[PDB]
Amino acid sequence: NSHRGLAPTNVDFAFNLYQRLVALNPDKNTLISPVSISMALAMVSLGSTQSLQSLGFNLTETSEAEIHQSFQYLNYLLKQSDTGLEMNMGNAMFLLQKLKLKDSFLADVKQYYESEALAIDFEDWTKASQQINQHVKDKTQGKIEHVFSDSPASFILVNYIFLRGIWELPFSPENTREEDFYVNETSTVKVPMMVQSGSIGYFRDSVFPCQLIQMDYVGNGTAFFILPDQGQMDTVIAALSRDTIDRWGKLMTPRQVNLYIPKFSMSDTYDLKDVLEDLNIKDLLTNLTLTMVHKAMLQLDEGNVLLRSEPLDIKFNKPFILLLFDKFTWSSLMMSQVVNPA
Numbered sequence: 417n418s419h420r421g422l423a424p425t426n427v428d429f430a431f432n433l434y435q436r437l438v439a440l441n442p443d444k445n446t447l448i449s450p451v452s453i454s455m456a457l458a459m460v461s462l463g464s465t466q467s468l469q470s471l472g473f474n475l476t477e478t479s480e481a482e483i484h485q486s487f488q489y490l491n492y493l494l495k496q497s498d499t500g501l502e503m504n505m506g507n508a509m510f511l512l513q514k515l516k517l518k519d520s521f522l523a524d525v526k527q528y529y530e531s532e533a534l535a536i537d538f539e540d541w542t543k544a545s546q547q548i549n550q551h552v553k554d555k556t557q558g559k560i561e562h563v564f565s566d567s568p569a570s571f572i573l574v575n576y577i578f579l580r581g582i583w584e585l586p587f588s589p590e591n592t593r594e595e596d597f598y599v600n601e602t603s604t605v606k607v608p609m610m611v612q613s614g615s616i617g618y619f620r621d622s623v624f625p626c627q628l629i630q631m632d633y634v635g636n637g638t639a640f641f642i643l644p645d646q647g648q649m650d651t652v653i654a655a656l657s658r659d660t661i662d663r664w665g666k667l668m669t670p671r672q673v674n675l676y677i678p679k680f681s682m683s684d685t686y687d688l689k690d691v692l693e694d695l696n697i698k699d700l701l702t703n704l705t706l707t708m709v710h711k712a713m714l715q716l717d718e719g720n721v722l723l724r725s726e727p728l729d730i731k732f733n734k735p736f737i738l739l740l741f742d743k744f745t746w747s748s749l750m751m752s753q754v755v756n757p758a
């Protein structure tokens with residue numbers, strides 16, 4: 417069970433953060449990777465107790481070494497569901513001005529996490545931001561092309577994750593066709609809609625009015641597509657917890673379905689300074705300003721590697737919730753509110 421030792425903490429943290437973010441802006445697409453955010457905060461706590469406490473740990477019960485060792489081990493366990501998941505995750509620190517990180521900190525970070533520190537010598541912010549942008553692109557297989565544009569900091573942390581998976585039940589690109597997606601009450605937009613028929617894990621819940629489709633990736637990855645009943649998005653969002661997802665996971669059963677899911681890439685940024693407030697940058701530097709951002713990017717596509725029951729049609733053609741998890745570590749790989757895939 418040790419491979420799952422951080423799940424309860426990490427996943428409580430993930431659902432609370434997600435709910436907070438959806439509340440702050442309910443009308444936007446939200447995409448984050450909680451496990452990636454947990455890693456980034458844990459990593460910065462190497463050089464800074466209020467960071468770790470904010471992640472959900474009580475340090476009277478778990479020592480510092482225990483946490484960093486658990487996170488190290490988790491990072492190794494995560495890079496293994498990659499049989500059917502392209503998952504470029506990492507942390508880059510960019511140091512502007514004449515600033516150097518402590519040798520102690522830089523070493524601890526390389527060791528327990530896989531982070532990188534780069535000196536940006538351009539005073540001009542346009543160049544600086546571009547170099548920072550070229551970095552993260554290269555590290556994400558050409559996929560995250562911009563992070564900044566935007567207020568220049570002296571010390572910049574980028575936590576990034578590109579994710580893209582191969583389905584156990586892939587869609588046929590031939591079947592993908594333009595359909596209406598209903599964004600809100602007045603506006604429809606056209607999106608490429610993927611379509612397949614088959615026996616697919618499905619649940620129609622009543623306490624929280626939604627329908628769920630569970631789509632497995634090849635490997636240990638899995639996706640919950642959650643379609644709230646009409647008018648019920650706020651309710652379902654409030655339902656989200658480790659308690660609730662445990663229930664759902666146990667009630668999913670194969671059912672013959674006609675399944676319509678949009679093909680899209682989504683990306684989003686999250687200011688880590690609202691979970692990691694009042695860091696002392698001087699604790700990290702050998703001896704001004706601070707930008708710490710998490711950028712997540714999900715490519716959702718057809719995902720291919722190479723009965724006398726009437727099927728039910730379920731279309732994700734209006735806003736929905738997308739939760740990606742690792743079945744092995746119980747990690748939250750991504751949580752999303754998909755409001756508009758066009």
Ligand SMILES: C[C@]12CCC(=O)C=C1CC[C@@H]1[C@@H]2[C@@H](O)C[C@@]2(C)[C@H]1CC[C@]2(O)C(=O)CO
Nearest residue numbers: 423424427638658661662665741742743746
């Ligand atoms: C709440 C739960 C169990 C207790 C825990 O500390 C953390 C979690 C979060 C992730 C959950 C997990 C289990 O319920 C099994 C789940 C649902 C997993 C995500 C995907 C899962 O592995 C399955 O889909 C199993 O079919």
